[PDB]
Amino acid sequence: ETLNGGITDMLTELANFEKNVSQAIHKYNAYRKAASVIAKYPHKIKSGAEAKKLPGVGTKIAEKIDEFLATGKLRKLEKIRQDDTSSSINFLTRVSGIGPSAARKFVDEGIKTLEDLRKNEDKLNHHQRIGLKYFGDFEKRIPREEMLQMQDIVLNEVKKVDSEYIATVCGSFRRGAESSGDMDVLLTHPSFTSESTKQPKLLHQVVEQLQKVHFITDTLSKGETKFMGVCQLPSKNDEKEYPHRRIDIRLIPKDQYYCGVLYFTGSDIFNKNMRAHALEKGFTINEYTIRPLGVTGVAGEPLPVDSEKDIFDYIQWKYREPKDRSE
DNA sequence: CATTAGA
DNA sequence: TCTAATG
Ligand SMILES: [Ca+2]
Ligand SMILES: [Ca+2]
């Protein structure tokens, strides 16, 4: 967590670059298991050779470790950090819809800047074009103060359309977090669960409402269960407009909520941790269900859920108010 | 790890 | 179809 710090962070830098600027999936996979093993070690690494004892650690990375260790740096690490093209990719990627594939592709083409991107909006796709529009706005944080304004409205139409809908703005926000990056709306209906062969319109209906009132402004992607978009808070009695925000809304089988909900509500840890317990508690939790183990090795049989409660009751824990689901 | 666009 | 990108 700290005594191993420099090694890791270097290693990740190491990894991330391989997958990113190069195509090095493996070196990249190589680096990560290392900064993985190397992270777990309980003592200080005083030498490569020492590290090298590790699993996944080799001549390759040990050599790296000594140098890192000997002098406060690493050249390979230094040259990339300097590397124009490489920087370029790490940069372009920041764009909503740009990825390592596109990244590099763009780059070989001559497009290295935010401005480059503009002169050739043609070369970009709807996702990316949008992404281009709201680069600034997408990188911003989202004050909870707004989370609530956003939350409100949405819960607002959700209701108008159909009183029988259920939404839950999950994520960090949910968890009381001062600021969030994207609003995360989960959504279900009685009329849609397990077998009931959809009703895509279930999803569609809302999206329409939302735009209809001006909450929705663009569509990154729209599927019959997963809408992916851009929203905005009605820029008040002037002098103050609201930055465009990323939003996602998703359809779900009422028979699946609570877990679903539980899950996306995190924290990443809280989950893993509760989940670990469900194992002892003779269970299994996953993004959609809760099944009870069979000593045989594994088992099935989805236990029925009406709330975050059942899931608690099942594994015999203390219901954790989302506030404190941090770990 | 599943969903969407796209080409 | 496969492949890239978000989450
Ligand atoms: Ca080894
Ligand atoms: Ca990106």
Side-chain angles (χ1 to χ4, degrees):
Chain A
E1 285 173 294
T2 221
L3 66 164
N4 293 129
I7 294 190
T8 48
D9 306 316
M10 139 212 258
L11 257 41
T12 84
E13 263 214 35
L14 257 308
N16 270 296
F17 155 107
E18 310 279 4
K19 126 101 152 259
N20 293 167
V21 166
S22 22
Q23 192 162 81
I25 166 63
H26 287 325
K27 292 197 192 181
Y28 151 77
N29 231 163
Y31 275 120
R32 55 150 325 160
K33 99 292 185 209
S36 170
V37 300
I38 102 69
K40 282 184 165 163
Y41 188 73
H43 321 312
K44 245 178 171 67
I45 308 174
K46 281 13 207 332
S47 55
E50 176 179 333
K52 206 189 162 182
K53 309 172 160 291
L54 270 326
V57 199
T59 146
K60 279 155 301 67
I61 316 143
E63 169 133 13
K64 290 179 264 267
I65 301 214
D66 284 320
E67 187 202 311
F68 173 64
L69 275 10
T71 88
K73 253 240 215 153
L74 182 73
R75 155 188 160 167
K76 205 184 158 201
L77 224 48
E78 114 205 313
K79 153 179 189 162
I80 272 161
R81 202 275 135 168
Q82 267 148 216
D83 174 55
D84 140 82
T85 294
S86 153
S87 287
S88 281
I89 307 186
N90 312 99
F91 184 82
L92 254 33
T93 268
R94 304 220 324 210
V95 170
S96 201
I98 284 168
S101 158
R104 327 169 221 143
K105 164 220 129 204
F106 269 141
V107 169
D108 305 317
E109 281 189 332
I111 344 257
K112 301 170 193 170
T113 127
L114 207 154
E115 302 202 52
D116 289 23
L117 276 180
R118 310 168 159 123
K119 314 329 286 152
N120 337 232
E121 204 174 283
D122 67 296
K123 292 210 132 96
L124 299 185
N125 89 261
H126 175 96
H127 194 161
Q128 336 202 96
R129 300 216 178 171
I130 289 228
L132 182 43
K133 158 171 168 189
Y134 303 130
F135 186 94
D137 298 3
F138 279 11
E139 268 184 3
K140 305 198 231 94
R141 287 302 301 202
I142 312 159
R144 144 166 276 237
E145 347 294 308
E146 306 184 333
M147 273 334 207
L148 303 189
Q149 50 200 130
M150 276 182 308
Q151 146 151 320
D152 186 65
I153 329 166
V154 177
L155 327 180
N156 292 352
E157 318 288 304
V158 154
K159 175 148 169 158
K160 42 226 290 277
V161 65
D162 194 349
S163 153
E164 209 95 37
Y165 264 130
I166 325 142
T168 284
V169 203
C170 303
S172 59
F173 150 66
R174 169 73 147 18
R175 263 185 329 184
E178 303 263 356
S179 71
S180 327
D182 55 351
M183 107 170 306
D184 218 323
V185 203
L186 285 36
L187 171 75
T188 203
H189 196 242
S191 116
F192 177 57
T193 145
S194 303
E195 338 77 11
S196 76
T197 203
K198 321 269 183 191
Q199 226 196 348
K201 288 295 166 153
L202 276 165
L203 164 50
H204 300 184
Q205 259 188 182
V206 298
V207 182
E208 223 183 7
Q209 181 42 203
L210 275 50
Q211 338 199 174
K212 198 219 139 198
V213 306
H214 329 295
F215 198 69
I216 284 143
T217 61
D218 317 267
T219 285
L220 276 25
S221 97
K222 206 242 303 315
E224 74 198 323
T225 35
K226 210 203 197 168
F227 163 94
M228 225 151 72
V230 187
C231 52
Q232 183 185 100
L233 299 170
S235 306
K236 330 245 190 207
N237 29 171
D238 264 346
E239 296 283 7
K240 86 296 263 283
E241 155 161 310
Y242 271 109
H244 281 67
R245 289 186 199 298
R246 278 286 299 80
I247 203 223
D248 299 340
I249 333 178
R250 47 226 309 176
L251 203 44
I252 313 279
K254 151 110 223 272
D255 96 281
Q256 30 174 208
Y257 223 54
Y258 308 120
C259 293
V261 146
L262 212 50
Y263 172 82
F264 263 143
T265 296
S267 65
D268 281 329
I269 94 257
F270 175 48
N271 271 168
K272 289 185 168 188
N273 270 117
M274 163 167 57
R275 280 188 177 190
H277 176 88
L279 257 341
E280 298 340 284
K281 302 337 146 96
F283 296 121
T284 193
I285 340 290
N286 87 131
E287 44 290 25
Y288 328 109
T289 30
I290 203 209
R291 305 151 332 155
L293 275 340
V295 72
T296 100
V298 325
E301 282 17 48
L303 278 12
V305 186
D306 262 37
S307 193
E308 276 193 312
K309 195 28 184 143
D310 294 310
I311 309 143
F312 284 65
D313 305 340
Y314 280 17
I315 71 186
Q316 61 225 137
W317 245 8
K318 70 161 144 168
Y319 181 142
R320 332 221 57 217
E321 254 225 347
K323 142 218 269 268
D324 67 65
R325 298 284 200 66
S326 313
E327 85 138 4

PDB file of all heavy atoms in Angstrom, chain A residues 52-57, ligand 1:
ATOM      1  N   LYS A  52      12.258 -10.507  -8.037  1.00  0.00           N
ATOM      2  CA  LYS A  52      12.388 -11.580  -8.957  1.00  0.00           C
ATOM      3  C   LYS A  52      11.967 -12.885  -8.377  1.00  0.00           C
ATOM      4  O   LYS A  52      11.561 -13.807  -9.078  1.00  0.00           O
ATOM      5  CB  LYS A  52      13.736 -11.646  -9.613  1.00  0.00           C
ATOM      6  CG  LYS A  52      13.587 -12.341 -10.953  1.00  0.00           C
ATOM      7  CD  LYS A  52      14.854 -12.714 -11.704  1.00  0.00           C
ATOM      8  CE  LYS A  52      14.507 -13.767 -12.755  1.00  0.00           C
ATOM      9  NZ  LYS A  52      15.653 -14.256 -13.534  1.00  0.00           N
ATOM     10  N   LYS A  53      12.079 -12.981  -7.084  1.00  0.00           N
ATOM     11  CA  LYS A  53      11.667 -14.214  -6.465  1.00  0.00           C
ATOM     12  C   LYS A  53      10.170 -14.393  -6.741  1.00  0.00           C
ATOM     13  O   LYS A  53       9.605 -15.494  -6.703  1.00  0.00           O
ATOM     14  CB  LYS A  53      11.843 -14.168  -4.936  1.00  0.00           C
ATOM     15  CG  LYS A  53      13.221 -13.719  -4.513  1.00  0.00           C
ATOM     16  CD  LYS A  53      13.300 -13.505  -3.022  1.00  0.00           C
ATOM     17  CE  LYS A  53      14.726 -13.533  -2.493  1.00  0.00           C
ATOM     18  NZ  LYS A  53      15.357 -14.867  -2.559  1.00  0.00           N
ATOM     19  N   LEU A  54       9.533 -13.283  -7.015  1.00  0.00           N
ATOM     20  CA  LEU A  54       8.154 -13.379  -7.235  1.00  0.00           C
ATOM     21  C   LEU A  54       7.649 -14.138  -8.424  1.00  0.00           C
ATOM     22  O   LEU A  54       8.326 -14.557  -9.356  1.00  0.00           O
ATOM     23  CB  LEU A  54       7.512 -12.015  -7.167  1.00  0.00           C
ATOM     24  CG  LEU A  54       7.051 -11.643  -5.765  1.00  0.00           C
ATOM     25  CD1 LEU A  54       6.536 -12.814  -4.915  1.00  0.00           C
ATOM     26  CD2 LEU A  54       8.012 -10.680  -5.082  1.00  0.00           C
ATOM     27  N   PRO A  55       6.356 -14.324  -8.349  1.00  0.00           N
ATOM     28  CA  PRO A  55       5.644 -14.967  -9.406  1.00  0.00           C
ATOM     29  C   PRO A  55       5.317 -13.779 -10.354  1.00  0.00           C
ATOM     30  O   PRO A  55       4.938 -12.654  -9.936  1.00  0.00           O
ATOM     31  CB  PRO A  55       4.408 -15.644  -8.740  1.00  0.00           C
ATOM     32  CG  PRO A  55       4.701 -15.734  -7.232  1.00  0.00           C
ATOM     33  CD  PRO A  55       5.951 -14.887  -6.995  1.00  0.00           C
ATOM     34  N   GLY A  56       5.514 -14.039 -11.629  1.00  0.00           N
ATOM     35  CA  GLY A  56       5.289 -13.084 -12.693  1.00  0.00           C
ATOM     36  C   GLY A  56       6.449 -12.113 -12.850  1.00  0.00           C
ATOM     37  O   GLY A  56       6.520 -11.278 -13.766  1.00  0.00           O
ATOM     38  N   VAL A  57       7.371 -12.217 -11.935  1.00  0.00           N
ATOM     39  CA  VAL A  57       8.474 -11.340 -12.008  1.00  0.00           C
ATOM     40  C   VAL A  57       9.638 -11.963 -12.664  1.00  0.00           C
ATOM     41  O   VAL A  57      10.038 -13.098 -12.364  1.00  0.00           O
ATOM     42  CB  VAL A  57       8.758 -10.896 -10.670  1.00  0.00           C
ATOM     43  CG1 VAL A  57       9.589  -9.652 -10.844  1.00  0.00           C
ATOM     44  CG2 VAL A  57       7.381 -10.673 -10.054  1.00  0.00           C
TER      45      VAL A  57
HETATM   46 CA    CA D   1       9.782 -15.561 -10.574  1.00  0.00          CA
END
